[PDB]
Design a protein around this ligand. Structure first.
Ligand SMILES: NC(=O)c1ccc[n+]([C@@H]2O[C@H](COP(=O)([O-])OP(=O)(O)OC[C@H]3O[C@@H](n4cnc5c(N)ncnc54)[C@H](O)[C@@H]3O)[C@@H](O)[C@H]2O)c1
Ligand SMILES: NC(=O)c1ccc[n+]([C@@H]2O[C@H](COP(=O)([O-])OP(=O)(O)OC[C@H]3O[C@@H](n4cnc5c(N)ncnc54)[C@H](O)[C@@H]3O)[C@@H](O)[C@H]2O)c1
Ligand SMILES: [Mn+2]
Ligand SMILES: [Mn+2]
Lengths: 347, 350
């Protein structure tokens, strides 16, 4: 029915993950999802227990599952250690072993939460944009690449199958939202841009259901500050995606609000944007919105349950208004806010 | 003082004319020996000659001390073959003169915070100069090309290329707040890493100037959350295109953003906005970006810094007193130009 690997890891990870589970448990019960999950050691919580960051039962409970609900990893106790044993590269091994080529990051400014944004209210109102970013190609992994005394070079390269697959994801995401996709390239100057555009156009042919439009990267940066509310789904290569999803991530005005999904060949991974936050670890104050919204994401993208995920979304939106956490100017601790999410979910 | 005026298309002529009106006034007051000549460029040139950058305009440009440039393009030209695009005309202008350094200041004038997309508290005091490398990087790098299977472009810089654009930004910061942010991707890319190490090497020649490094993705967050923290920013061609474009929307009207392009040949001065065909020939275009560009011209082409700052004084005051329509006021191009000229006369007869 619903098989889930839970990797809470380090710091606030365990706390915010436990919060998501309450929500998932509340759902399973009232809706009958047949939720099956197990908990797996990960990051520094595993380096202490299995001399490794991403160990034997975890590697395999990952392959076995239909989805991975990740907390966050790293901390104070684990600083300045090898690329071998590093928590932050356990993340990279996890993400690679599943061949995850697409990163989906939504920035939503919730009703009533306009004041938080660094944009003026008028501009901030009604922003909900899903940036989809190609993740295993582009300039970051392109060749030729090198450096000498005299110069350095790097290659932004994309092949047809790399653009196609990421574009379908974005197209499939659009079918479940508002049926509008914007594709981002540098088509007026670069051969890769023009190749990107044309391929996404070819893929679009199979989705006349979805409105498709093309924006250049430099002008996309003007639009996300000037009128971000105009967008639904946005798809782009790796470096532009990095740049523009980071840009969009600031629009809501709190890091604790940001969920992430990573899709591909293997087992999908849902996780908060934020880190293990050892500065506020175990003070009972960590805002679980990001992990819960990661659980929502897990429902829509790994299991087909789109109406259910919108329920979790609507529950979370109402709670942020009613009992805002400290990072929002509010006063509600993790526990009390989760209970607020459940009151709304029980209605 | 020998200028080549390249008015261009749409509002281009309109706003360039207002810039000239400010210049003739200055020439009268101060005795500049201003000499200028008007050349076809962009769509205008395509209609008369079939190419965006004719030999006659190439020669005018080569032979003057500065170019004052409006803007190019419009529906009549936009989707044309490449050899003859308004856009290609631009690249040809910049390459001919080898203008490697694109200087783009974004300023929220005292009292104009309400205009910004950003909350008043965050737009307050913003004044950031993006120094963008203009002749190199991924946009001109080889190998490049496309087949049915794949496509590739090459982000690459060499040492003397990073060095000279670096020098320009340190010299710029030295006449400002003495703070440079260099921007790379040193954490993932070889080119980032080389960019960074080379800027540090140039930084040692400017001990009075504080030098800091930021990744492009991070910069992009920082320019929205805390843009007022920055003085000078220096970066490559694509990151510069992106970040300076981002910064250009912070003031809240593209009517307000001037720019300079400086290199080996004749420097080019131009508003950041396009040809605004929605409003062209309606007499409402804001001439600020053009007037400020002519002020950049006076400092960087002619060493008339105190004049350039006076011009910026008269503009800032006029913005407040009689705002143009893009600021919520009613002041047409000419009416606004007059207000500027009156504050210029008034501040000078003191
Ligand atoms: N995606 C990731 O897993 C990730 C990302 C960045 C950093 N890290 C790692 O985590 C550790 C901390 O680095 P960091 O502090 O820059 O990342 P961080 O997200 O933990 O810290 C960001 C800041 O925002 C606050 N914050 C973060 N999440 C919050 C939440 N859910 N509710 C309320 N406040 C919240 C933190 O207290 C901190 O001041 C480091 O070891 C770093 O390497 C991990
Ligand atoms: N430097 C350049 O030459 C340059 C830059 C950008 C676009 N373009 C070209 O110009 C056209 C672009 O039209 P566009 O709408 O995308 O960009 P645009 O900058 O011309 O217009 C953007 C918006 O700002 C308004 N606006 C711009 N300048 C103004 C001013 N000085 N005063 C008052 N309002 C102003 C316009 O009316 C429009 O609504 C195309 O042909 C494009 O190729 C040229
Ligand atoms: Mn990033
Ligand atoms: Mn641009």
């Amino acid at each position: 029915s619903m098989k889930v690997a839970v990797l809470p890891g380090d710091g606030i990870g365990p706390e915010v993950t436990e919060a998501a589970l309450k929500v998932l448990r509340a759902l399973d019960e009232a809706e009958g999802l047949g939720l099956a999950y197990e908990v797996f050691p990960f990051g520094g919580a595993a380096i202490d227990a299995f001399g490794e960051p991403f160990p034997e039962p975890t590697r395999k409970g990952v392959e076995e599952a239909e989805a991975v609900l990740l907390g966050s990893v790293g901390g104070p106790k684990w600083d300045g250690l090898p690329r071998k044993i590093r928590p932050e590269t356990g993340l990279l091994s996890l993400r690679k072993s599943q061949d995850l080529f697409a990163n989906l990051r939504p920035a939503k400014v919730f009703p009533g939460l306009e004041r938080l944004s660094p944009l003026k209210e008028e501009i901030a109102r009604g922003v909900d944009v899903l940036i989809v970013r190609e993740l295993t190609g582009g300039i970051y992994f392109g060749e030729p690449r090198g450096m000498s005394e005299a110069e350095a070079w790097n290659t932004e390269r994309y092949s047809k199958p790399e653009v196609e697959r990421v574009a379908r994801v974005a197209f499939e995401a659009a079918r479940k939202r508002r049926k509008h996709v914007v594709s981002v390239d540098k088509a007026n100057v670069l051969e890769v841009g023009e190749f990107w555009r044309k391929t996404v156009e070819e893929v679009g042919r199979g989705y006349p259901d979805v409105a498709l439009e093309h924006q250049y990267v430099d002008a996309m940066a003007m639009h996300l500050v000037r009128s971000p509310a105009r967008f639904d789904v946005v798809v782009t290569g790796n470096i532009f995606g990095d740049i523009l999803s980071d840009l969009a991530s600031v629009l809501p005005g709190s890091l604790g609000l940001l969920p992430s999904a990573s899709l591909g060949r293997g087992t999908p991974v849902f996780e908060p944007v934020h880190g293990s936050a050892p500065d506020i670890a175990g003070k009972g104050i960590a805002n679980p919105t990001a992990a819960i919204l990661s659980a929502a994401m897990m429902l829509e993208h790994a299991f087909g349950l789109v109406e259910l995920a919108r329920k979790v979304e609507d529950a979370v939106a109402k709670a942020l208004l009613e009992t805002p956490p400290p990072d929002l100017g509010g006063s509600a601790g993790t526990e009390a806010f989760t209970a607020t999410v459940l009151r709304h979910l029980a209605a």
